[PDB]
């Protein structure tokens, strides 16, 4: 078991024991038997983490939001009884990306064969008109050449 996965069935002080090393049948039985230490698991999370609630619905949205704090971004990939969940899933990931998580939305579709077709529009125009040009810098003046 990698350190990324935070166990929510074994107490923090017992993580170093051999039982908390593999997710074998013993781990499943212990999780199904022992209590769930959700709050403790959510304490190791940083103060500005981006927690994605992967589930059929945003069940633990309120619980997680209260547990984490104020500086942690929270997103749910699904919404109950939603007329359209695909849009909800895309909006959730768009929110996640907007807060600084890399991803490849095109990984859900067959990869495009490069080089692309010559009919692809130009991306230079978009970047040209998407600069931060608030400040005005010095430019040569006619009076300086005389």
């Amino acid at each position: 078991r990698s350190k990324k996965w935070i166990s929510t069935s074994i107490p923090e002080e017992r993580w170093g024991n051999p039982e908390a090393q593999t997710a074998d049948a013993s781990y499943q039985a212990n999780n199904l038997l022992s209590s769930v230490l959700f709050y403790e698991g959510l304490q190791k999370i940083p103060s500005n983490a981006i927690a994605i609630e992967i589930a059929p619905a945003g069940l633990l949205q309120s619980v997680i939001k209260k547990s984490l704090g104020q500086d942690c971004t929270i997103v749910a990939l699904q919404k109950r009884k939603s007329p359209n969940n695909l849009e909800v899933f895309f909006s959730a990931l768009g929110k996640c990306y907007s807060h600084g998580v890399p991803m490849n939305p095109l990984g859900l579709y067959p990869a495009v064969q490069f080089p692309v077709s010559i009919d692809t529009p130009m991306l230079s125009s978009m970047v040209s008109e998407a600069w931060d040009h608030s400040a005005k810098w010095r430019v040569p003046l006619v009076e300086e050449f005389e």
């Binding site: 990698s2 994605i52 589930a55 768009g94 996640c96 807060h99 692309v116 009919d119 692809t120 006619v142």
Partner: protein, 618 residues
């Protein structure tokens, strides 16, 4: 400590021009240039952007870029003092180079550390005198921001290139000289990419007076191939292009068949006189060395300065070299009657027009060609034909000339890239377009353009190749859904520090009729559910039935809820993994620990699904 030598081996593959960007007169970007060219819009105007229309008696009309007072100093890591004591040409060129890099599907991280050479061509150094007339302390930073040797080097320093960075000054034919150098270095194996480019901005009216005293300039706009032509009009450009090996290029406007250079020598008509023989010999050599059938040329981007001594000789050389054997008129044209003469950026202008002709597949019209020049017999014999209106260039070879003052000629040939688009399975289903920029308005415009091309997947791929830049470079991160029933758009400023992506898995109670039904639109989600249903079928569970036609009474039981929740969790995990999201931490509630194990690599799809099945069975 020992350093591994680089494998400097000659390259024999194709070289493709992948990116293009630049500022042109009355055109803030390439798109505006293309629109103006194809609408017969004259880009040489009369105003007081640089000086009064007639100051010191200089010609009133000139080709001037929209603005040269703008620069995103913070993006390129240049402090206020350096940016202030910095040539506007180099600032605009740096912006144009970044735009061209992004255009070719490249990004800051991808191009960092590559064996790329920079071959900027700049000759204007007029900002040195103005800044030195009233020199004061703190102006010393001009050495690192004003020297001509700092145009390519800064590009090397900012983008972290580790290839030959040199500045060239060949006059009106410098851009194609840099292209020649890039071809030379690419073929020897030193570099894999090139940032060939060049900028030219007019600042000193006395320079215009100096050119006038030599009869260089005319009265009206450049009358290319016109009997009344008497000179050229100065222009401004800050264009740049990116070249890459065709095998590693994510976008190919065209292919560089070959470019070469030559000189005129001791001509009896003066140093400032074109040599028809020299240009003809250069053309013959280039079409013979590469075994290119000169009769295959479809469009010819001529160096139409508009003078009475330049156009006739260039046309004669073209007729003798490329029109020999042609059974149809050869369409000639120039980009000087549209925006004037760019001086040290004329060749880049021709490259820009060629990459526009071969991208839009239409030859831009030529302006001011009213009466054919009587000294150009090719226009009356049917061998030559100026393209006065939009002509449908289908495909083939396009040739460019650049005859610099002093006799240094240059020729180059490009082969069109014919890979017309084919439909993608996407472009009719919702997609998540994610990107980043420096300003909210810029990102909004980017999303508007993406919506304009919602039916193009290749465009989305090109955007995505540079949509993962760190927040430091592009703090404004945004996302929008193309082909969406309901409009969605988010734009936020993300600090430089990177936040942690933690996965949280829910447990029981997330059940409901239709769970994951909509997400079946995604291929990966459906595939994952199918590959899990096949696993659970031998155990008496038909996952597909419970998930699609399942009812509330079915979900009231113990088995179907556990099975469906795990299936959704695993399918969503597969969706996230395919999209390329790596979780820095994983936590889960009871019944979600199996999903955490699956996403963590400690378990498998079979193990996780059967673990949930065993739990609910017990």
């Amino acid at each position: 400590p020992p350093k591994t030598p680089n494998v400097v081996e000659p390259y024999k593959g194709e070289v493709a021009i992948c990116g293009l960007s630049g500022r042109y007169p009355e055109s803030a970007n390439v798109g505006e240039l293309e629109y103006n060219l194809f609408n017969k819009i004259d880009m040489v105007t009369i105003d007081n952007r640089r000086w009064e229309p007639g100051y010191l008696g200089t010609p009133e009309r000139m080709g001037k870029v929209k603005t040269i007072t703008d620069f995103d100093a913070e993006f390129f890591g240049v402090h206020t003092k350096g940016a202030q004591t910095m040539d506007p040409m180099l600032r605009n060129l740096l912006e144009v180079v970044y735009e061209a890099i992004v255009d070719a599907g490249e990004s800051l991280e991808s191009m960092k550390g590559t064996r790329t050479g920079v071959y900027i061509g700049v000759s204007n150094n007029e900002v040195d005198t103005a800044y030195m007339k009233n020199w004061t302390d703190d102006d010393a930073y001009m050495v690192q921001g004003c020297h001509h040797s700092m145009y390519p080097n800064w590009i090397s320093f900012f983008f972290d290139f580790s290839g030959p960075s040199t500045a060239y000054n060949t006059a009106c034919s410098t851009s194609l000289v840099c292209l020649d150098a890039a071809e030379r270095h690419l073929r020897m194996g030193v570099i894999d990419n090139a940032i060939v480019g060049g900028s030219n901005f007019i600042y000193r009216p006395a320079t215009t007076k100096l050119f006038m005293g030599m009869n260089f300039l005319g009265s009206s706009t450049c009358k290319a191939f016109d009997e009344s032509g008497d000179g050229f009009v100065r222009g401004e450009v800050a264009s740049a292009i990116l070249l890459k090996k065709a095998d590693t290029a994510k976008r190919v406007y065209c292919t560089l068949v070959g470019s070469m250079l030559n000189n005129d020598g001791n001509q009896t008509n003066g140093i400032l006189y074109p040599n028809s023989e020299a240009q003809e010999q250069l053309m013959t050599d280039i079409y013979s060395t590469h075994k290119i059938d000169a009769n295959e040329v479809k469009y010819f981007e001529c160096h139409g300065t508009g003078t009475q001594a330049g156009d006739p000789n260039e046309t004669r050389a073209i007729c003798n070299a490329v029109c020999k054997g042609k059974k149809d008129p050869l369409l000639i044209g120039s980009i000087k009657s549209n925006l004037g003469h760019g001086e040290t950026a004329s060749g880049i202008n021709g490259i820009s027009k060629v990459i526009i002709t071969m991208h839009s597949r239409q030859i831009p019209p030529n302006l001011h060609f009213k009466n054919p020049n009587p000294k150009i017999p090719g226009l009356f014999d049917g061998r030559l034909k100026v393209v006065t209106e939009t002509t449908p260039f289908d495909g083939g070879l396009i040739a460019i000339n650049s005859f610099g003052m002093g006799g240094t000629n240059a020729h180059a040939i490009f082969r069109s890239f014919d890979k017309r688009a084919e439909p993608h399975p996407a472009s009719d289903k919702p997609r998540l377009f994610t990107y980043c920029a420096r300003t909210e308005e810029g990102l909004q415009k980017i999303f508007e353009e993406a919506h304009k091309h919602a039916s193009n997947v290749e465009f989305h791929a090109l955007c995505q190749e540079s949509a993962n830049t760190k927040p430091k470079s592009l703090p404004y991160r945004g996302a929008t859904i193309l082909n969406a029933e309901g409009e969605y758009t988010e734009i936020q400023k993300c600090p430089s520090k990177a936040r942690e992506v933690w996965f949280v898995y829910s447990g029981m109670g997330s059940q409901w009729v239709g769970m994951g039904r909509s997400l079946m639109a995604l291929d990966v989600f459906r595939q994952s559910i199918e590959e899990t249903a096949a696993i659970l079928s031998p155990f008496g569970v038909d996952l597909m039935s419970l998930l699609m036609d399942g009812t509330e009474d079915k979900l009231k039981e113990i088995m179907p809820p556990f099975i469906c929740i795990n299936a959704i969790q695993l399918a969503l995990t597969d969706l996230l993994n395919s999209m390329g999201i790596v979780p820095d931490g994983l936590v889960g509630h009871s019944l979600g620990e199996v999903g955490c194990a699956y996403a963590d690599g400690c378990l498998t799809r079979r193990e996780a699904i059967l673990s949930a099945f065993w739990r609910a069975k017990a």
